[PDB]
Design a protein around this nucleic acid. Structure first.
Length: 203
RNA sequence: AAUUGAAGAGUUUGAUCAUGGCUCAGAUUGAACGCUGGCGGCAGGCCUAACACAUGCAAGUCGAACGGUAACAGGAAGAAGCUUGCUUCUUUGCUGACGAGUGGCGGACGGGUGAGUAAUGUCUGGGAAACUGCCUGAUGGAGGGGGAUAACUACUGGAAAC
RNA sequence: UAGCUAGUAGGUGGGGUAACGGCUCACCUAGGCGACGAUCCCUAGCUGGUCUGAGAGGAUGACCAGCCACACUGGAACUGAGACACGGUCCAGACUCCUACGGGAGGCAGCAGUGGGGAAUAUUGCACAAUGGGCGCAAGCCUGAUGCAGCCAUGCCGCGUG
RNA sequence: CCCGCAGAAGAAGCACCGGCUAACUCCGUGCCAGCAGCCGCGGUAAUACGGAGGGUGCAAGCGUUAAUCGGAAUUACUGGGCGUAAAGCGCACGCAGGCGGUUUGUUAAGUCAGAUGUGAAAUCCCCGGGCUCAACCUGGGAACUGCAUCUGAUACUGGCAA
RNA sequence: CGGCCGCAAGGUUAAAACUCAAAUGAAUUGACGGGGGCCCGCACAAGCGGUGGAGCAUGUGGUUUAAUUCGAUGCAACGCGAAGAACCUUACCUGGUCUUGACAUCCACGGAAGUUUUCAGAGAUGAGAAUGUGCCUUCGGGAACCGUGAGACAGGUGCUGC
RNA sequence: UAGUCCGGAUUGGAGUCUGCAACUCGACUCCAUGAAGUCGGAAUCGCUAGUAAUCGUGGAUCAGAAUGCCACGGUGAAUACGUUCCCGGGCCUUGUACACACCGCCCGUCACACCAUGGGAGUGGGUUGCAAAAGAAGUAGGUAGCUUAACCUUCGGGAGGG
RNA sequence: CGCGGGGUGGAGCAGCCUGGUAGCUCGUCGGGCUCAUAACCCGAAGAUCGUCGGUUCAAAUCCGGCCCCCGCAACCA
RNA sequence: AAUAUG
């Protein structure tokens, strides 16, 4: 959840911004006001938002010296809004910032393995041929057989024989190994893929 | 005419006596909170932030110190309107007075506060090298002259204070 | 907290103050204070008293009264009998307000009262009728000193609820 | 402040009840819930919890909490201890400090006696007086255990001499 | 922790927060000691014959089951309560049945009690057909006994031997 | 001298008896079958004289139902040198941190839960010594210039001030 | 196991080329001891010697195949 | 010889 402490000059303003604040609140991030004030912003107002862990916000009215003493000691942000629509916007922006949802992935390259080599003590070592896209060291991979995923991981070695390289491109012979894994045979497929976040704003 | 007074208990151990702590019965406050609350007398009532402050009020007063009319309260003189005996309205510091001002005395008292101060402080007992308007007792002078300046007038810099 | 002191300790001369004085200067001498606790740090307004205690003692300094210190922070002087001045002044600093933004104004640790602090402490009252001050020959004016009321079971004491 | 009118009319709560400590049973809960100042109560017959009845204390207050002293001879001067319970330095020599055999003279510092000045007033205390009495207010006395100076005493201690 | 001292290890000097309601000395009675003395018992020693192996009896635990009734569990339970489970005993189990009742006291009312027999049902049992009319009392009746109905009640080897 | 003319388990067939009843679940007989077992691990029990041991008999219980229990008799022993030792018990004395009594009590690591606190490179504030910079305002000292009513004057200016 | 050391009971070992009997520690399950428990003591369970053949009175450790694990060379980009 | 815990 996110907490706010709001202290306005007038009694109408706490009643007006409380009505909009219960619209913003939702299961994803819950917002609540704690100890709504009327009048000058004090030490005891700032101490409550230090106790509860909360944002210190103000309508027209602004901080006293004894409120500044608490803010300079224990850092709590002070933002006052004399325009109420921008105040209803800025709480929503704080709630939106708390959220960070993921969404999607897409292949960078796809490769088929052919002509296996196989250590007695260090497992199978796969020759590959990239059929589409760019195969690259620095991103997640999906090892699949017959459309089921055998393993997922990050590439350890992109390396035909001794030719260790960060990236290699379609239509070219490659050699391949994945971190903490050595079960890559013949007729397996590697899909290497880049990942996409969404970071959606709150409703 | 007289200065009168001192209580203990519980609790270590199976039980005892010591040593010994902890706790309670007493009286009290510049008190708070809880529950309850009819009236009267007398006394007390921001101990915390010497933290910050709206508005009103908390030191002025003398015309028997002096120019003066800024008043307004009359009189007198005078001019008018006529009602010829009256109101009306200009002059006049003449006057009962009195804003602003000059000058006198008070503003150092009365009141608030406990921040700083462990000794320039305070309290108690002494001292000399001193002053002391206002208040008193004692003895004498209180003669004769001059130049300014605020107020007020004539202007002017200034948003406002000035 | 065991060593601390150069105007430090003493003398002469000059200057200074109402007056004594390293008070302040020039020169000369090398002392001064120190375990009967110097110096340094922390903490604290002090006393007549209050409270407790059989007394000795202990704790404590609200109210009342005496005295000192402080007056937004820091420093200085003037006027005056007396101030290095709570509601006088000048300058700097912090901070609040006003403004034509150039530049100015303000100091409730006076009485009421408000914000804030905090467990918690009051009415933006009435009158100079009385006592006592300030001015004045006096009338008289001024006096949130003081006398009074309002508010709270806060305390003491009296009375009732037959 | 006094008189008159009406009619028991308008006006009693609070804590506590196992021992300490004045004041007892039943019911509900069943080592749960909770009480608790201290030692402790409650795990199916709870005089200790919760409720009810009865009882005890105190009164327009009652109780809890915080704060101070008392009890506490538990910092012990008056008024405690140190063989084994907390407590005699591991032991010795020694400066500063404390204390000192016995005789006479002298001084009068300490000490003891008397007097004067001072020990603010309020307070405290006693005897009185005035508010319906009391609280409260107030007359006078005593008190203010102290200190300084002067005049005396010389046993004891100190100084000084033999 | 700080100062001082020491080459260093360390010594000397020396707290507070916090926690517990006890910590502790001597002494008394008892128990305990792989502490000591003395002393006794099929305790050992000296012997005899057995158990523990085997088969069977009876009992217990465990196991299983619709039920394997309940209690007894170191010596001081385990051929025990049980001096004797084919039904009964018998409590436990599956069915079939009754609810003032199988069994006692009590009230009211009718019918002597009773000896005979049959069908249906596993039996408990219901439903019949038979037969009899007894001691005292004026038979006004009852005392014995059976059936019906009411409610006070009857019942429990259900639980708690802390 | 052997699994036997030793031992009788188990099982088949046919009977008897008590009783409403003999299937799971009786006793007993008759014929037939003839497991294991050839003296039993560590360990452990009883008994000191008509006893141990060994062979029979009777009763209570009871319709039928002992290898149990209770009772009776026949035959009938071994060995006790001794209290070193084990076990159990009594008395005296000693030690004790034990007192629901050694089946008592209780120590620390490590883990755990709870609780408080020290050091701390440093970082950010207040206060403040020392060395430099800074120098408002005010006072004190020195002053060319600018400016100047009182006093002095030869009337040009001086004295003196700002 | 390309070459190394091993394949024994539940685990770890001994039995060795010196071919005539697979036993010993910790465990497993029971019994005893103790007031009880651990400890201790007494017992019982548990094997084609991986798998096969050469072997030979009989392969028992002796041999070689099949096979498995590990040793390292290596089927070790 | 050696003997632990409740």
């Amino acid at each position: 959840e996110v907490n706010i402490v709001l202290k306005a000059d007038v009694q109408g303003s706490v009643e007006a911004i409380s009505d909009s604040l219960l619209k913003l609140s939702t299961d994803e991030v819950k917002v609540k006001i704690i100890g709504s004030g009327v009048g000058g912003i004090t030490e005891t107002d700032a101490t409550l938002a230090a106790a509860s862990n909360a944002i210190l916000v103000g309508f027209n009215v602004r901080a006293d010296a004894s409120a500044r003493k608490v803010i300079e000691a224990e850092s709590l942000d002070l933002r006052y809004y004399s325009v109420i629509y921008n105040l209803i916007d800025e709480v929503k922006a704080a709630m939106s910032g708390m959220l960070s949802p993921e969404l999607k992935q897409q292949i960078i390259g796809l490769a088929e393995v052919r002509d296996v080599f196989k250590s007695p003590k260090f497992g199978a070592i796969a020759g590959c041929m990239v059929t589409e896209g760019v195969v690259k060291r620095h991103n997640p991979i999906r090892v699949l057989r017959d459309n089921v995923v055998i393993y997922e991981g990050e590439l350890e070695s992109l390396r035909r024989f001794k030719d260790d390289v960060n990236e290699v491109r379609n239509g070219m012979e490659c050699g391949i190994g994945v971190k903490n894994y050595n079960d890559v045979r013949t007729g397996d497929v590697i899909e290497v893929f880049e990942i996409i976040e969404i970071q959606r704003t709150i409703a």
